């Protein structure tokens, strides 16, 4: 499938590329997200004129992502209380829902898919590192401390 990219994607190209991808890749990912559109005559022409608009919007969202990553790095310490037994071991877990709800309690809102917990789902109490991304580039970090309820 001959597709035109509406944003920079992975190792395919930047905004504006007559790229040949597999049909399942175009059909199931790149078109139902706002990342690509097929190479139709109208489509081609449309993009050409909208190229400027896109470039702009493409940036306004990287600046907002950098501002949100700056607010995450300003926050830098979030506390969650949960049930822990003896030896500092959680009977439950600290979910992505709990991390996101604690971040919304600390500041302005952050949804569920933005957290990139590298090891697990925080089965023990103590100081843990959780990554947050709001774009394809920025990878900011949060110290999370779990205390006993």
């Amino acid at each position: 499938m001959q597709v035109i990219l509406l944003d920079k994607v992975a190792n395919l190209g930047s905004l504006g590329d007559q790229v040949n991808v597999k049909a399942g890749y175009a059909r199931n990912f790149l078109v139902p997200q706002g990342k690509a559109v097929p190479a139709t005559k109208k489509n081609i022409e449309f993009f050409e004129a909208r190229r400027a608009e896109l470039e702009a919007k493409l940036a306004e969202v990287l600046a907002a992502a950098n501002a949100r990553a700056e607010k995450i790095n300003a926050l830098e310490t979030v506390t969650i209380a949960s049930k822990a037994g003896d030896e500092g071991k959680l009977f439950g877990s600290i979910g992505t829902r709990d991390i996101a709800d604690a971040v919304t309690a600390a500041g302005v809102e952050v949804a569920k898919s933005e957290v990139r917990l590298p090891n697990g789902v925080l089965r023990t109490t103590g100081e843990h590192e959780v990554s947050f991304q709001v774009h394809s580039e920025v990878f900011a970090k949060v110290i999370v401390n779990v205390v006993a309820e």
Binding site: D86, E87, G88, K89
Partner: protein, 106 residues
Amino acid sequence: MRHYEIVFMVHPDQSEQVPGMIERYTAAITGAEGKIHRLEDWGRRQLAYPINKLHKAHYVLMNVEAPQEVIDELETTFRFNDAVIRSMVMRTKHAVTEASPMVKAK
């Protein structure tokens, strides 16, 4: 009322939690009107053979006088606690109070 010698070895990554263990087990004995006769925290030391692929262990020696039922609850706690890797419960004839060789030598 019987006299017991307790030795237990904690996994060395849990050695920061061994004052919590000692105060928990001393509270459990003294809630049953028991007496602690000797408390000794030997700390980290090397093992003669590896136990669960570990070369070191934290050692705590207790000498208590307690009922049989709270002593049985103590070894059930020992069995279901993941942090302690080995323990021994021994009957002694009388209460002992004098220092063990591994604090007498230092």
